[PDB]
Amino acid sequence: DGICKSSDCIKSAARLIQNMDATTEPCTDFFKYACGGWLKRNVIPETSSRYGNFDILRDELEVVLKDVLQEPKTEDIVAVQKAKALYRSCINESAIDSRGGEPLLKLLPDIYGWPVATENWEQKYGASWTAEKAIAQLNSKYGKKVLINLFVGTDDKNSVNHVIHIDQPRLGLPSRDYYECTGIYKEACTAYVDFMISVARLIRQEERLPIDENQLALEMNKVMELEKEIANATAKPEDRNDPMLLYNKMTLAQIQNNFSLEINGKPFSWLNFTNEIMSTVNISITNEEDVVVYAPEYLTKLKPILTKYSARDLQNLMSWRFIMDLVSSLSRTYKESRNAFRKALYGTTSETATWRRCANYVNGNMENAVGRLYVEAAFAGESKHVVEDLIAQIREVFIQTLDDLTWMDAETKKRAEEKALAIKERIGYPDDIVSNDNKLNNEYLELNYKEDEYFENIIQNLKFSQSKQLKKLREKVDKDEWISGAAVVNAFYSSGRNQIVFPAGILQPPFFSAQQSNSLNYGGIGMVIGHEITHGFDDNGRNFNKDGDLVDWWTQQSASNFKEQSQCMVYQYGNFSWDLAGGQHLNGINTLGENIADNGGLGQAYRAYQNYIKKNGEEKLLPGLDLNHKQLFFLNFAQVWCGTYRPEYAVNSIKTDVHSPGNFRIIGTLQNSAEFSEAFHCRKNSYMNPEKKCRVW
Ligand SMILES: CC(=O)N[C@@H](CC(=O)O)C(=O)NC[C@H](CC1(C(=O)N[C@@H](Cc2ccc(O)cc2)C(=O)O)CCCC1)C(=O)O
Ligand SMILES: *[C@@H]1O[C@H](CO)[C@@H](O)[C@H](O)[C@H]1NC(C)=O
Ligand SMILES: *[C@@H]1O[C@H](CO)[C@@H](O)[C@H](O)[C@H]1NC(C)=O
Ligand SMILES: *[C@@H]1O[C@H](CO)[C@@H](O)[C@H](O)[C@H]1NC(C)=O
Ligand SMILES: *[C@@H]1O[C@H](CO)[C@@H](O)[C@H](O)[C@H]1NC(C)=O
Ligand SMILES: [Zn+2]
User: Does the keyword Zinc apply?
Assistant: First the structure.
C-alpha cells in the first residue's frame, strides 16, 4: 500500500492535521495554512505573554521538573539534595508570607539604603556615599548594574582569556523606546512609577514611617525624569550590531582621561570603582589594566547628566532597580504591587503557578544538577547519536553550498570552510553530570540552603553567581564548559567558543524523534541545526574566526557583497507590519542576523533531506494527509512556530526580540524559498512566491 501505520507515524499525522487549516490556500498564507487549526483551538493563558509550540513544550518540561524535584530519595547525592531543598524553600509561600518585607529591610542598609523609604538619608548614608562604592556594592555582591555596567567576560580578540568590559546598563522598562511615555508606552510608564510608589509606601508602612503621598510622587517622578535621561543617552541596538566597531580596548588610564564623570560634586575614579568591585574576590587592579569599552558614546553623554543630580536622586534609582526584582520574592502584599506593571509589559492578569516559577528558578541556578535529573527521567540515549549524524550531514551541506555561492571569492570560501569544520557540537547533555558525582557535588559545595529562608537562598545565589564570574579575570576560558543546561527547549551558538548546542529539551517532537519520518526531522531539528551553524556566519558571527577571535577573514569584496546580499532581508522583513504590535513595522536591522539564520538553516536542511532521499529513497507516506514528504518537510518546519502574542507583549518584543515573530519567520523564509513554491505549485507573484527572493547562505 505504501502508507506508514506505526504508533509514531499516527501521533505525527494527528498532530499535523489538528494544527493545520486545509481550507486556506498554502500559497496565500502558509502561516494560516499550517497553524490555523491550532490558533482556533487555543487561547493565550492568563499567565502567558506568548503562547505557541515552544511554550507548550516548555510548560511540559516544567512538569517533568516538578516530578523529579518534589520527592526526596534516600540515594540522592548532596548536589541533588541542595536542588530539592531550594525547590522546597521556594514553594513554601506561607513561610515566605509570614516574613513580609523583613528580609528586604535587613538588606537595604547593605546597599546604602533607599532614600524615599528612609528618613534623614543624607545624614545616615550621604556621609560615606560615593558613586564608586555605591555602584560597586550592587554590582559585586548582587550582580545588579545600575549606571555603569562593568562585568568580566571573554576577550573578543583573544577567546582563551577574560577581560573587564564597560558597557551601558539595562533599564527598568523593556527598551529605551518606552521612555517616550506616549501612546503605546504611556500605560507602561505610568504603571512603572506607580510601581515605585506602591513599593515605597509598603516599606514605609512596614517601618511605621509617615507617608506623604505628594513627597512620594515627587521623588519617584524625579527617578523617572532621571532614567529618561540615561535611557535617551544609550545607543540604539542598530548602532551596536557591528562587533568590530564596538570593541574599543583601553587602559584605566585612557578611560580616566577620556571619560571623566562629575557625580555629587566629586570626580569619578575608575580605578577606585574597579578595585571596589574586584577586591570582593581578593584581586587588585592597576591603571595599566586593559579594558574593553562597548558604549564610549554613552559614557560621554553621561557626564553632563549626572552633574545635575544629587547623591540622593541617584540612589533612589539605583536601589529601586534592585528592589524591582526582590518584591516578587517577598510576601503576597509585595507581590501584588507588581500587578499593573506586569500587565503593562506582558499583558498577563496573574502570575505563573508557583511551582512552575520555582522549578524554573532551580533549573537556572543549578542547571547541571537539574539537567542530571531531567535526562535520567525524560531523555533517551539512542537519540544522542542520531543527532550527531544529522549535524554531520548539515555541516557538510553548508560546506558544499559554498562552492555554489557566487557572491564570494575563493579565498574567503576557504576561510569559511575552516570555521565550519571547526565548530564544536554539544548534543543532549555532558556525560559527567550523570557519571561524575564528585565534580557535580563540588560545583555547589559552597552553597548551603535553609528551607525556611527562601530570600536568603536567592541572595546567596546572587553572591555565588557574581563571585564565580569575577574570579575568572586571570583564568583561562574552560573549553569543556557547555553554554546551556540540558533541561532547555532551545538551541544556541557561541561566537567566542564557535560552538553549537542542542540540549535534550529540544530533542523531542515536533523537532526530532528517532521513530518519526525523516521529512519531519530535517524540517524540524535539521532546520534548527542549520540555524545555529549559520549563526557563525551572520552579520555578527562572521566577524569571529574558527577559534572565537574577533578578527577579519573576509576580502573587501566578499564583505561588501555580504552586506549587499543581506540588505535584501533587511528590506523584506522591515516591510512586514505586525497587527498585534499596532500595525508597526518590524525592525529589519535588529532581526537581520536571526532571519539570515532562518533562511540559511531551512535551505540547508532541505538539501540534506534531498541528499537523504538520494541515498535511501522515498519514505512511507503519512496517513490522513494528502501531502507528499517534501510538503511535510515545510509543514513541520512551519508548525514549529505556531503561536501568537498578546498585544502588550507584541509591543514589547518588536523592540526587544532579535527574532522575527513566529508568523513572519514562516512567511519570510518561504517567500525566499523556490523549493517551497515547487512543493506547493505556487503561482508566480502569489504572496508566498514573490519573484524577488532574498538569499545569503
Ligand atoms: C539576542 C540573542 O542573541 N539571543 C540568543 C541568545 C544566544 O544565542 O546566546 C538566542 O535567543 N538564542 C536562542 C535561539 C534559539 C531558537 C529560537 O528562536 N528560540 C525562541 C523560542 C520561541 C519561539 C517562539 C515562541 O512563541 C516561544 C519561544 C526564543 O527563545 O525566542 C530555537 C530554534 C531557532 C532559534 C537562537 O539560536 O537564536
Ligand atoms: C513551610 O514553612 C513552615 C515554617 O518554617 C513550616 O512549619 C512548614 O512545615 C513548611 N511546609 C513545608 C511543606 O515544608
Ligand atoms: C537625547 O540625547 C541626544 C544626544 O544623544 C540629545 O541631542 C537630545 O536632546 C536628548 N533628548 C532629551 C529629551 O534629552
Ligand atoms: C575607594 O575610595 C574610598 C574613599 O571614598 C575608600 O574608602 C576605598 O577604600 C577605596 N577603594 C579601594 C582603594 O579599593
Ligand atoms: C520596503 O522595501 C523597499 C524596497 O526595497 C525598501 O526601499 C524599503 O526601505 C522597505 N521598507 C522598510 C521599512 O524596510
Ligand atoms: Zn538564532
Answer: yes
Kindly state if the Cβ of 300 falls inside 6 Å of ligand 3: no
Reported residue count of the chain is 697
Q: Position of cell 535617551?
A: 232
Of the listed ligands, the closest to the CA of 308 is: 3
Please state, in angstroms and rounded to a whole number, the distance separating the CA atoms of residues 55 and 58.
5
Is 297 an annotated catalytic residue? no
657 is catalytic: no
Question: Binding residue per annotation — 531?
Answer: yes
Are 73 and 216 in the same domain? yes
Ligand 5 site, residue 574, Cβ cutoff 6 A: yes
Rounded Cα distance between 162 and 32, Å, is 47
* 472 phi and psi angles, rounded to 5 deg: -85, -5
Helix (H) or strand (E) holding 4: none
**Domain around 266:** 52-378+431-477
Q: Are 467 and 280 in contact (CB under 8 A)?
A: yes
> How many structural domains compose the chain?
2
Q: Cite the DSSP H helix spans in 92-185.
A: 93-97, 102-107, 121-124, 131-142
- Resolution reading in Å: 2.6
CA distance 545 to 551: 6
DSSP 170: P
Expt. technique: X-ray
Kindly tell me the sign of the dihedral angle through the C-alpha atoms of 239, 242, 245, 248. Answer: positive
